[PDB]
Design an enzyme around this catalytic site. Structure first.
Site, PDB file in Angstrom:
ATOM      1  N   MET A 187      -1.749  -6.814   7.283  1.00 42.31           N
ATOM      2  CA  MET A 187      -2.745  -7.774   6.815  1.00 42.31           C
ATOM      3  C   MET A 187      -2.294  -8.474   5.538  1.00 42.31           C
ATOM      4  SD  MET A 187      -5.931  -5.078   7.357  1.00 42.31           S
ATOM      5  CE  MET A 187      -6.005  -4.194   8.891  1.00 42.31           C
ATOM      6  N   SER A 188      -0.984  -8.603   5.357  1.00 41.15           N
ATOM      7  CA  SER A 188      -0.492  -9.250   4.142  1.00 41.15           C
ATOM      8  C   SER A 188       0.874  -9.860   4.345  1.00 41.15           C
ATOM      9  CB  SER A 188      -0.355  -8.215   3.025  1.00 41.15           C
ATOM     10  OG  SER A 188       0.682  -7.305   3.356  1.00 41.15           O
ATOM     11  N   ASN A 228       2.428   4.295  11.019  1.00 41.86           N
ATOM     12  CA  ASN A 228       1.878   4.964  12.186  1.00 41.86           C
ATOM     13  C   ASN A 228       2.152   4.258  13.480  1.00 41.86           C
ATOM     14  OD1 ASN A 228      -0.614   3.437  13.350  1.00 41.86           O
ATOM     15  ND2 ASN A 228      -0.977   3.408  11.133  1.00 41.86           N
ATOM     16  N   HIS A 241      -5.131  -9.339  -0.809  1.00 43.16           N
ATOM     17  CA  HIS A 241      -5.292  -9.553   0.622  1.00 43.16           C
ATOM     18  C   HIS A 241      -6.458 -10.487   0.891  1.00 43.16           C
ATOM     19  CE1 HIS A 241      -3.676  -5.454  -0.186  1.00 43.16           C
ATOM     20  NE2 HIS A 241      -3.002  -5.670   0.931  1.00 43.16           N
ATOM     21  N   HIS A 279      -6.917   4.412   6.252  1.00 41.25           N
ATOM     22  CA  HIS A 279      -6.109   4.092   5.080  1.00 41.25           C
ATOM     23  C   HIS A 279      -5.464   5.292   4.361  1.00 41.25           C
ATOM     24  CE1 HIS A 279      -4.676   1.431   1.960  1.00 41.25           C
ATOM     25  NE2 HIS A 279      -5.412   2.000   1.023  1.00 41.25           N
ATOM     26  N   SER A 337       0.818  -1.208   0.000  1.00 41.01           N
ATOM     27  CA  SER A 337       0.000   0.000   0.000  1.00 41.01           C
ATOM     28  C   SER A 337       0.859   1.268   0.000  1.00 41.01           C
ATOM     29  CB  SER A 337      -0.924  -0.016   1.234  1.00 41.01           C
ATOM     30  OG  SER A 337      -1.826  -1.125   1.200  1.00 41.01           O
ATOM     31  N   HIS A 384      -3.499   0.174  -4.864  1.00 38.18           N
ATOM     32  CA  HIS A 384      -2.912  -0.971  -5.562  1.00 38.18           C
ATOM     33  C   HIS A 384      -3.353  -0.897  -7.019  1.00 38.18           C
ATOM     34  CE1 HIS A 384      -1.732  -3.266  -1.794  1.00 38.18           C
ATOM     35  NE2 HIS A 384      -2.515  -2.276  -1.402  1.00 38.18           N
ATOM     36  N   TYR A 428      -8.637 -10.217   3.272  1.00 42.75           N
ATOM     37  CA  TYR A 428      -9.861  -9.489   3.607  1.00 42.75           C
ATOM     38  C   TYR A 428     -10.659  -9.089   2.371  1.00 42.75           C
ATOM     39  CZ  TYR A 428      -6.994  -5.334   2.547  1.00 42.75           C
ATOM     40  OH  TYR A 428      -6.132  -4.468   1.903  1.00 42.75           O
ATOM     41  N   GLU A 429     -10.012  -9.112   1.209  1.00 42.93           N
ATOM     42  CA  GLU A 429     -10.691  -8.770  -0.037  1.00 42.93           C
ATOM     43  C   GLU A 429     -11.651  -9.903  -0.380  1.00 42.93           C
ATOM     44  OE1 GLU A 429      -6.838  -7.449  -2.097  1.00 42.93           O
ATOM     45  OE2 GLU A 429      -8.340  -6.735  -3.526  1.00 42.93           O
ATOM     46  N   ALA A 475       3.123  -1.708   4.210  1.00 45.75           N
ATOM     47  CA  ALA A 475       2.931  -0.580   5.110  1.00 45.75           C
ATOM     48  C   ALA A 475       2.337  -1.290   6.333  1.00 45.75           C
ATOM     49  CB  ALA A 475       1.928   0.413   4.516  1.00 45.75           C
TER      50      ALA A 475
HETATM   51  N1  LIG Z   1      -2.630   0.712  13.189  1.00 45.43           N
HETATM   52  C1  LIG Z   1      -2.324   0.137  11.992  1.00 45.43           C
HETATM   53  N2  LIG Z   1      -1.662   0.879  11.055  1.00 45.43           N
HETATM   54  C2  LIG Z   1      -1.484   0.206   9.868  1.00 45.43           C
HETATM   55  N3  LIG Z   1      -0.744   0.628   8.770  1.00 45.43           N
HETATM   56  C3  LIG Z   1      -0.867  -0.352   7.806  1.00 45.43           C
HETATM   57  N4  LIG Z   1      -1.548  -1.369   8.260  1.00 45.43           N
HETATM   58  C4  LIG Z   1      -1.870  -2.627   7.572  1.00 45.43           C
HETATM   59  C5  LIG Z   1      -3.301  -2.679   7.087  1.00 45.43           C
HETATM   60  N5  LIG Z   1      -3.258  -2.153   5.731  1.00 45.43           N
HETATM   61  C6  LIG Z   1      -4.595  -1.927   5.145  1.00 45.43           C
HETATM   62  C7  LIG Z   1      -5.082  -0.521   5.463  1.00 45.43           C
HETATM   63  O1  LIG Z   1      -3.992   0.355   5.558  1.00 45.43           O
HETATM   64  C8  LIG Z   1      -4.512  -1.980   3.630  1.00 45.43           C
HETATM   65  O2  LIG Z   1      -3.879  -3.169   3.203  1.00 45.43           O
HETATM   66  C9  LIG Z   1      -1.916  -1.073   9.554  1.00 45.43           C
HETATM   67  C10 LIG Z   1      -2.645  -1.841  10.531  1.00 45.43           C
HETATM   68  O3  LIG Z   1      -3.108  -2.991  10.404  1.00 45.43           O
HETATM   69  N6  LIG Z   1      -2.796  -1.155  11.756  1.00 45.43           N
END
Ligand SMILES: Nc1nc2ncn(CCNC(CO)CO)c2c(=O)[nH]1
Ligand SMILES: [Mg+2]
Ligand SMILES: [Zn+2]
Length: 278
Positions: free
Chosen positions: A216-217, A240, A83, A251, A30, A61, A85-86, A113
């Protein structure tokens, strides 16, 4: 899900539509799609025009497979990934990894990310993935579930040495040559299902289990990659610091963080390309 032949057909289709013969594959997460520029002699295929490929439905994506030369090195990049979740089962999420092995790729670079659990992490940090925790695997959701395909690998592959040690050492050396102010982080990535973001109680829990970053990947891909013999290297872009006390994740903010780190990740991956052996 797929038969060995299915992977073959897709591999043969790619081999006959481009002259490029990549040695390394890169899966961009992402907000990491920008890595595709600077690629020279690039050839793009939309996932939708390649037989048997799944589709990227998540914002950020592109859903394109890009062949090209990065820093004197032939490679193929997934600008966008899949992913769970998709709605895709892991055997669909990881279909591309086996195709890459059938094209002659030897090294896989995974990127994502993720949220930072380790309190020493700062937004914008880059964390090398030294190891992972596969929560879905604890319950049986695994891309290798079902009859084993001997042509790819063995019935019970080991995962303790998943993230190649030498490449991690090389990543550390490359980083010092960049004169960065921040140091290169390194840690354990934990994967959960998504698509919702975690609660405070969940984050505390993840941290106490020894996790440094959450996403999540990636994990399904590493597993399948190690099973069919690919060398693997990966990193998370810390988007973050996760809330551990009783703001809120979104997101758009993770994508924003990806744009800001573009110059940094691009040079980092470029340089790194000149350090892959074979
Ligand atoms: N707090 C937190 N920050 C994050 N930054 C990226 N992701 C991974 C999830 N990614 C999703 C939405 O960003 C898209 O694949 C996360 C997560 O799961 N938790
Ligand atoms: Mg061309
Ligand atoms: Zn054609």
């Amino acid at each position: 899900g797929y038969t060995y032949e299915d992977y073959q057909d897709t591999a043969k289709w790619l081999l006959s539509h481009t002259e490029q013969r990549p040695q390394v594959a890169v899966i961009c997460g992402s907000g990491l799609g920008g890595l595709v520029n600077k690629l020279t002699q690039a050839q793009t295929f939309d996932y939708s025009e390649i037989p048997n490929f799944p589709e990227s439905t998540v914002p950020g994506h592109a859903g394109r497979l890009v062949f090209g030369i990065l820093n004197g090195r032939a490679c193929v990049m997934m600008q966008g990934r899949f992913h769970m979740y998709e709605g895709y089962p892991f055997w669909k999420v990881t279909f591309p990894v086996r195709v890459f092995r059938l094209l002659g790729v030897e090294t896989l670079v995974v990127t994502n990310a993720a949220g930072g659990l380790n309190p020493n992490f700062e937004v914008g940090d880059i964390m090398l993935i030294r190891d992972h925790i596969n929560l879905p695997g604890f319950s049986g959701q695994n891309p290798l579930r079902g009859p084993n395909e001997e042509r790819f690998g063995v019935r019970f592959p080991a995962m303790s040495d998943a993230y190649d040690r030498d490449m991690r050492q090389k990543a550390h050396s490359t980083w010092k040559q960049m004169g960065e102010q921040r140091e290169l982080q390194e840690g354990t990535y934990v994967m959960l299902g998504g698509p919702n973001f975690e609660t405070v109680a969940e984050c505390r829990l993840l941290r106490n289990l020894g996790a440094d970053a959450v996403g999540m990947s990636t994990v399904p891909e590493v597993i399948v990659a190690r099973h069919c013999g690919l060398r693997v290297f990966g990193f998370s872009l810390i988007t973050n610091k996760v809330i551990m006390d009783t703001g809120k994740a979104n997101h758009e903010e993770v994508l924003e963080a990806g744009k800001q780190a573009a110059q940094k990740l691009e040079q980092f991956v470029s340089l790194l390309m000149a350090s892959i052996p074979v």
